[PDB]
Amino acid sequence: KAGMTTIVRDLDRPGSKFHKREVVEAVTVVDTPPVVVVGVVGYVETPR
Amino acid sequence: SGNGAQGTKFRISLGLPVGAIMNCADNSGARNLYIIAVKGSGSRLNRLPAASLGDMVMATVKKGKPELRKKVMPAIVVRQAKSWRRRDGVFLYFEDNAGVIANPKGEMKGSAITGPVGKECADLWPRVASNSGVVV
Amino acid sequence: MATRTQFENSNEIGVFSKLTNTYCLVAVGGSENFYSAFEAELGDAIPIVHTTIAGTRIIGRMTAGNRRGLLVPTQTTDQELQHLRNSLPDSVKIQRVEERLSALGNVICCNDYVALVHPDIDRETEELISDVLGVEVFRQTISGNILVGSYCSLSNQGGLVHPQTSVQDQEELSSLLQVPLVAGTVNRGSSVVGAGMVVNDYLAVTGLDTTAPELSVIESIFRLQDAQ
Amino acid sequence: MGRYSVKRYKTKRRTRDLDLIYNDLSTKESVQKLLNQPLDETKPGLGQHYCIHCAKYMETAIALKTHLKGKVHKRRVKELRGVPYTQEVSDAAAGYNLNKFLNRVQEITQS
Amino acid sequence: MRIYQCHFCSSPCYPGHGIMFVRNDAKEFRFCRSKCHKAFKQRRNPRKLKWTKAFRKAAGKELAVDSTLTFAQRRNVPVRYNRELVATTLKAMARIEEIR
Amino acid sequence: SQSRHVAQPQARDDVKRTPFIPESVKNLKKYDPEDPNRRKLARDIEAENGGAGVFNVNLKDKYLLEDDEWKNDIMPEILDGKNVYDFLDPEIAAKLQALEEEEEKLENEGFYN
Amino acid sequence: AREHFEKTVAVDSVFEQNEMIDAIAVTKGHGFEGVTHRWGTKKLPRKTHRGLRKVACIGAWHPAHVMWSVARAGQRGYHSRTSINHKIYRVGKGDDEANGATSFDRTKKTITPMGGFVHYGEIKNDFIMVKGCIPGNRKRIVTLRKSLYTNTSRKALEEVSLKWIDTASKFGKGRFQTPAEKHAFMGTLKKDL
Amino acid sequence: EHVTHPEQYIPGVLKRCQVKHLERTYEISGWKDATEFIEILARKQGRLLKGGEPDESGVSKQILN
Numbered sequence: 001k002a003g004m005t006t007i008v009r010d011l012d013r014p015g016s017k018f019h020k021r022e023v024v025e026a027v028t029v030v031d032t033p034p035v036v037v038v039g040v041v042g043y044v045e046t047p048r
Numbered sequence: 049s050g051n052g053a054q055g056t057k058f059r060i061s062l063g064l065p066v067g068a069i070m071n072c073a074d075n076s077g078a079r080n081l082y083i084i085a086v087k088g089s090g091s092r093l094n095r096l097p098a099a100s101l102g103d104m105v106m107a108t109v110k111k112g113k114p115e116l117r118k119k120v121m122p123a124i125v126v127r128q129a130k131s132w133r134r135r136d137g138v139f140l141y142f143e144d145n146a147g148v149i150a151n152p153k154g155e156m157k158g159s160a161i162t163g164p165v166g167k168e169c170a171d172l173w174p175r176v177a178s179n180s181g182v183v184v
Numbered sequence: 185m186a187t188r189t190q191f192e193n194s195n196e197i198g199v200f201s202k203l204t205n206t207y208c209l210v211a212v213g214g215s216e217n218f219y220s221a222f223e224a225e226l227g228d229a230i231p232i233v234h235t236t237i238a239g240t241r242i243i244g245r246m247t248a249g250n251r252r253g254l255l256v257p258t259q260t261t262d263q264e265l266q267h268l269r270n271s272l273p274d275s276v277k278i279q280r281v282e283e284r285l286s287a288l289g290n291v292i293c294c295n296d297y298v299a300l301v302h303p304d305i306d307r308e309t310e311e312l313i314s315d316v317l318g319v320e321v322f323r324q325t326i327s328g329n330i331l332v333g334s335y336c337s338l339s340n341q342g343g344l345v346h347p348q349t350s351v352q353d354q355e356e357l358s359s360l361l362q363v364p365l366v367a368g369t370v371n372r373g374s375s376v377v378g379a380g381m382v383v384n385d386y387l388a389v390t391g392l393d394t395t396a397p398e399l400s401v402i403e404s405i406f407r408l409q410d411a412q
Numbered sequence: 413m414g415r416y417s418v419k420r421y422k423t424k425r426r427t428r429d430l431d432l433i434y435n436d437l438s439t440k441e442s443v444q445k446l447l448n449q450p451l452d453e454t455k456p457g458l459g460q461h462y463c464i465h466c467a468k469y470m471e472t473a474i475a476l477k478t479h480l481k482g483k484v485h486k487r488r489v490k491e492l493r494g495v496p497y498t499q500e501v502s503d504a505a506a507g508y509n510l511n512k513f514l515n516r517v518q519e520i521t522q523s
Numbered sequence: 524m525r526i527y528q529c530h531f532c533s534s535p536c537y538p539g540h541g542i543m544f545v546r547n548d549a550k551e552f553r554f555c556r557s558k559c560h561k562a563f564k565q566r567r568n569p570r571k572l573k574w575t576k577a578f579r580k581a582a583g584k585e586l587a588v589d590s591t592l593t594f595a596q597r598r599n600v601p602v603r604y605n606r607e608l609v610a611t612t613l614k615a616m617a618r619i620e621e622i623r
Numbered sequence: 624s625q626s627r628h629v630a631q632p633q634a635r636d637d638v639k640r641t642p643f644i645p646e647s648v649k650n651l652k653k654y655d656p657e658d659p660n661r662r663k664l665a666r667d668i669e670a671e672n673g674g675a676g677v678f679n680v681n682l683k684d685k686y687l688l689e690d691d692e693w694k695n696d697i698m699p700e701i702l703d704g705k706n707v708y709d710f711l712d713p714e715i716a717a718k719l720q721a722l723e724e725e726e727e728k729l730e731n732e733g734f735y736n
Numbered sequence: 737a738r739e740h741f742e743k744t745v746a747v748d749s750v751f752e753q754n755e756m757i758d759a760i761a762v763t764k765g766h767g768f769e770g771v772t773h774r775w776g777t778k779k780l781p782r783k784t785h786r787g788l789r790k791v792a793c794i795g796a797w798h799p800a801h802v803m804w805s806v807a808r809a810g811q812r813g814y815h816s817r818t819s820i821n822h823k824i825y826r827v828g829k830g831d832d833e834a835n836g837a838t839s840f841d842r843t844k845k846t847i848t849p850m851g852g853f854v855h856y857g858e859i860k861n862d863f864i865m866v867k868g869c870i871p872g873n874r875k876r877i878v879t880l881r882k883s884l885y886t887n888t889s890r891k892a893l894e895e896v897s898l899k900w901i902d903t904a905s906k907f908g909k910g911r912f913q914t915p916a917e918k919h920a921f922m923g924t925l926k927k928d929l
Numbered sequence: 930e931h932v933t934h935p936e937q938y939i940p941g942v943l944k945r946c947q948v949k950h951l952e953r954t955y956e957i958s959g960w961k962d963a964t965e966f967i968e969i970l971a972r973k974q975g976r977l978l979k980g981g982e983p984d985e986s987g988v989s990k991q992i993l994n
Contacts, residue, residue: 001761001876003853004869006137006539006902007825008524010840012894015676017056020212021239022263022524022899024137024539027825028870029847030878033861034744040737054194054241055213094778114964118934129423136239136261136524137539138553143423143546155374159329163547167240167259170287174196177242178334178379181285181302182549184238184259205643212682215675216665223664224654229647234682251643262525262598262708266698269601270686280599284549297640340642342629354630362632362640385642405629407642413561421564429546430566453968456981471981497570497577499550505533505576506921507592507623508709514588524840524899525706534911535704535921539902556909585923590722595709602713606693609711613842615719616702616710620920622726677890701841701900704917 002031050087050104052154053172060168062098063130063145069110071146073126073165074158074179077113081123081147084108101128102169105147116149121157123147124173126165126180134168142166148176185408186388186399189221195371195391196379198244198337202289203382203389205251205296205340207272208232211241225387233271236264245379248288248333250296253277253316257286279316283309293332293378295340298361300324300332322360327353334378337370340385342405344368346375366405370394428467431496436464465489495520531559531569533576591623747862751880753827756892757864758820758881761872765814775807821887822866825896830861840899845914850905865901935989939963942992967992 007025011018049057064070064083072078085106086097099105107123109116126148131141142164149157154175161180170177177183191200192214200218202209208226210219212234222232237246238259248255253276256265260280269278283306285291291302292313299319301310310321326335327349335346336357342364345354349367358365370380371391381390381402388406390399403409436442443464452459461470463479465488470476479485495501495517504513526535534555542560544552554560562572569575579585586592594615602608655661669678683695699707712718729735751757771777772789780788790809794802802808828835828847836847847865848858856874864880872878883892904910912918932938940963943951952958957973960966970976970992971983978984 001870001872001874001878002856002859002863003849003874003906005847005849005865005906007865007867008137008538008840008899009825010897010899012679012897013890014679015214017058017213018135018239020234020682021136021236022538023135025825025867026869027865027867028822029853029859030864030866030870030880031856031859031861032747032864032880033830034746036742036744037737037740039741055192114937118937131542138541138543140543140545140551141423143426143544159335160331164545164549167238167242170245171240171242174194174199174242174379175376177199177240177245177287178196178290178376179331180287181291181331183240183242183246183257183287184545184549184551206645216669216678216680217675220664220666223662226648227651227654227662229645229651231685231687233685234680262700262706265601266604266708267682267686270604270688273687274603278601280597280601282599286549296643297638340640351628351630354628358630358632359635362635364629364631366629386644386648417561417565421566423564426564427566432546432548454980454982458981469981491568497568499530499552501577502528502530502533502569504587504592505580506528506535507589508528508595509597510588510592511596524700525708526701526704535917537902537904537911537913538900540904540909540911555911558909590725594712594715594718594722595705597709598711602711604688604693604696604698606690606696608713608715609698609707611719612707612711612715613699613702615715616705616707618719619710619722620703620705622722623920697839699840699842701843703843704913704921 002029004028049172050154051152052150052175053104054174055172057102057168057172058135060100060102060132061130062100063128063132064099064103064105064125065096066098067096068099068145070107070123070125071127071144072109072112072149073146073161073163074148074156075160075162076116076149076158078109078116078149079112080110081105081107081149082110083123084120087122099125100130101125101132101166102172104150104152107147107149109149122150122152124150124154124169124176126161126169126176127163128166148179150175185225185386185410186390186403186406187221187225188392188394188399189218189389190392191218195374195393196376197389197391198289198334198379198382199242200244201382201389202244202247202249202254203384203387204249204254205384205386206230207251207254207276209235209243209247209254209268211243212236213241222389225389231272233268235268235271238264242287243289244382245287245289245334248292248294248317249276250294250317250319251276251384252296252318253279255279255281255288255292255313255316257288258282259286277316279312281309281312285309288333290331290333290378293326293336293338294319295338295343295361295363297340298322300326300336300338300357300360302330302332304330324357324360326357332378334376337377337381337383338363339383339406341407342366344370344377344402344405346377348375364405366401368398368401368405370398370402372398430491431498433465433467434492434496436467437492465492527553529553529555529559531555531563531575532572534559589623591619594619747864748827748829751824751827751864751882753824754895755824756821756883756887757824757866758818758883759822759866759870759872759878760816760818760881761870761876761878762816763813763871764873766812768810769812770809771807774809774812777807817871819871821883821889821892822868822870823891823894823896824864825867825898826863826865826901828859828863828865830859830863835859835863836901836903838898838900841901843913843917845903847901847903849903850910850912850915850918851907854906930990932990932993934986935993936964936967936985939967939989939992 007027008022009025011023068083069080083105086099087104089097103125105123127142127146129145131139133139156175156179164182165180167184170183200211207230208222237243293300299321303323313321326332326345329335337344345367347367354365370377372393372395374380449459456469456471461476500513504510524538530552536553536555541554569577580587672678771791777791834844836845852858903913943963957969967985967988968983971988976984976988
């Protein structure tokens with residue numbers, strides 16, 4: 001989680017009161033560099 | 049929402065609790081209104097019913113024309129001193145919090161409104177938008 | 185050719201729509217039923233434009249205009265103003281007015297030829313009405329009612345004023361407008377007639393709850409029925 | 413933020429702004445309206461004795477005459493001589509509607 | 524959306540920033556930040572506060588009358604859309620910022 | 624009961640005031656909801672695309688341009704902190720070129736020595 | 737998986753824009769915090785003996801115990817939470833400059849605010865911008881999950897059309913989107929001649 | 930004291946009492962109406978609230994007492 005910032009969004013929500021109207025939204029920016037696979041785990045399905 | 053309200057109303061910050069004097073924007077002869085109740089308010093235990101722009105209240109005319117006082121008529125808040133949010137993000141407020149006398153079906157007792165009227169209230173009440181010379 | 189319609193179950197047609205001779209503005213909201221109820225009576229003959237004015241659905245009371253041009257309040261965003269320009273052909277001037285009485289629909293009651301305005305609108309705005317809309321302007325009240333646009337529905341044929349309009353005030357306003365004036369109601373006894381309906385020379389749309397005598401007087405004074 | 417500024421400059425206690433007062437002073441009709449005013453049971457002195465610049469009411473002709481000799485009245489008068497600070501001024505200062513600012517200043521200076 | 528300018532210090536008030544005050548005259552007062560809003564509520568003159576752009580223009584700290592500063596005005600009468608016109612507008616703005 | 628009127632305009636000036644009805648209106652077919660071939664209203668497109676609240680109306684496909692290929696193109700709002708709409712102006716090339724002439728004159732006159 | 741044992745997986749190979757995702761993270765920690773704000777219990781009247789920021793009566797004559805349900809003071813925050821249905825507003829690309837630019841805003845800027853984020857550096861990498869707030873504070877590992885069900889709200893279907901991203905500074909009342917804009921608004925300083 | 934709008938009962942007092950006596954109990958004269966009888970009395974007695982307006986309800990309470 002990097003932080004938050006402000007977004008203007010051109011809202012296309014038919015049936016809404018903000019339909020076809022720009023709306024300012026708060027958003028969260030998550031820094032996501034690529035993750036690299038290093039292993040496998042196999043799960044069996046047991047009565048416990 | 050209420051009777052005569054056009055469509056839904058979104059959240060805006062509540063400015064006017066019960067017991068709040070608010071100006072009379074219309075020309076019905078009242079000079080200020082005293083909120084005794086708020087339509088639509090939920091039942092939280094110690095929470096005072098509070099009113100905001102575009103909300104219909106029940107108000108007594110406390111000062112003004114004696115033909116209007118000692119009576120409890122519905123009112124519709126048209127201005128507000130508490131800063132609320134507009135979705136095209138801006139927090140705004142008016143210099144005074146004011147309302148207009150309306151019959152419970154939405155019609156204005158007065159024939160005009162003086163001073164600005166918030167667009168959240170003009171949009172919600174067609175008879176307010178139709179009696180307001182200044183919107184936003 | 186008076187028609188009954190309700191924008192999302194409201195008889196105030198003139199709040200949610202603007203109608204002139206050569207275009208029609210209808211608010212954005214919910215479905216297309218209001219738009220289509222204008223389109224049935226107009227088709228593609230004149231442009232029917234969905235629009236919002238400052239995001240509100242009250243475009244009829246916010247904007248003022250006739251077949252020659254359209255005025256929009258200073259609160260209308262650049263996107264909405266561009267939308268109105270893109271939608272309407274160049275024969276219709278569009279102007280954003282830097283004027284206090286932003287609800288131009290309430291404040292200006294005009295047809296193609298003459299306009300009535302709030303008695304205290306700015307001189308610059310009077311001049312801009314005279315230039316853009318191409319009308320001669322009069323500061324008047326509809327029997328003491330300053331919001332002339334809401335209390336007077338007007339076309340080139342005739343005009344309808346709010347029922348408490350005095351007889352000599354009807355006469356004086358008819359002289360100014362050069363149309364016959366009558367004082368009646370719309371939407372079953374509403375005195376706010378400008379908000380209660382939209383009208384031009386060949387169409388009038390009123391709220392669904394208009395009484396039949398009220399349509400009779402509307403179609404008389406506004407000369408809707410063909411070959412009257 | 414403190415105590416005094418929040419006590420004095422609430423939107424409850426907000427007084428008349430300077431450009432509005434400038435426009436009140438602009439024409440002879442508005443000023444002659446503001447001086448010869450209708451009686452008003454709520455306003456001090458029943459609405460007579462108005463100081464146009466300060467936009468506040470005095471209780472009597474003595475309190476108005478004493479008001480016109482005080483540094484508060486001088487401070488308000490000095491604040492109003494030039495060109496009122498409107499949104500024209502805050503717009504042109506960033507390169508925006510600069511032409512209307514300029515010719516507004518010319519109109520104010522010539523009238 | 525658009526950038527408004529702070530009624531006090533002429534700074535850009537982007538969407539979601541500052542607050543606005545509306546008088547009984549429908550005159551909106553945008554403010555970039557609570558600093559300018561509070562200085563306005565306190566009736567402080569922005570032309571005597573040195574950190575405002577109004578002071579710097581009035582005193583001559585920055586250039587006021589120029590050809591580059593006339594191009595940005597509030598366009599009341601709109602124009603129809605045109606990709607060539609708007610692309611020339613974007614190129615124009617890139618040129619005007621450099622020259623100014 | 625003695626206790627229980629259209630005002631006419633005595634002419635003020637000789638200006639021709641006449642009603643306007645455009646030709647495309649007068650040439651129009653009156654609507655008939657009983658045709659198989661009547662005009663397709665907006666509800667009809669709305670009905671076959673999802674319903675009242677689901678039909679996302681494209682406001683763009685009905686406005687009038689010099690080219691339908693830029694019917695759906697996005698007009699930019701912001702660039703480097705400037706309102707594009709407020710710099711937007713017909714004949715912007717004319718003012719820009721006058722600015723360029725004045726500026727290269729300032730250069731050749733020696734303004735940034 | 738065998739084919740992937742040292743290859744990376746980019747974030748756009750898992751999520752994409754206009755998708756609702758779940759955010760699973762341990763919330764921000766607040767330490768030992770009392771009932772008045774750990775549970776929202778009303779403050780007792782002013783200058784109540786033994787204090788006013790505490791729950792007043794704890795029990796009846798029976799069950800002769802404090803129940804588990806009575807609100808008591810203790811640790812607030814740092815709890816594990818699963819917050820679901822966060823609409824993805826942008827899946828950014830690290831190499832792509834103008835991360836923070838859109839088709840309405842042509843400024844050619846990345847989503848990194850001026851001065852970077854506060855208590856977190858730049859965004860040099862791929863990023864996920866989700867609508868609204870997320871459990872956990874900044875710097876914190878979060879797990880983003882695909883939605884456990886095919887959501888039937890119309891929000892889960894909408895295409896998101898950003899007009900603008902606020903890249904102004906979060907370290908103050910930031911008024912500029914780029915250092916270039918700040919410089920062009922200020923003018924030249926005394927550091928410059 | 931608990932009468933919420935005691936300004937309305939004052940025309941009742943003017944009905945019961947006589948003007949000849951009421952001009953004398955309070956040294957005031959020439960009221961056209963009760964609603965202004967209160968205000969002329971209050972200005973006479975200095976029962977003006979902060980801001981120049983008469984303490985109209987309180988003077989009405991005193992008149993009823």
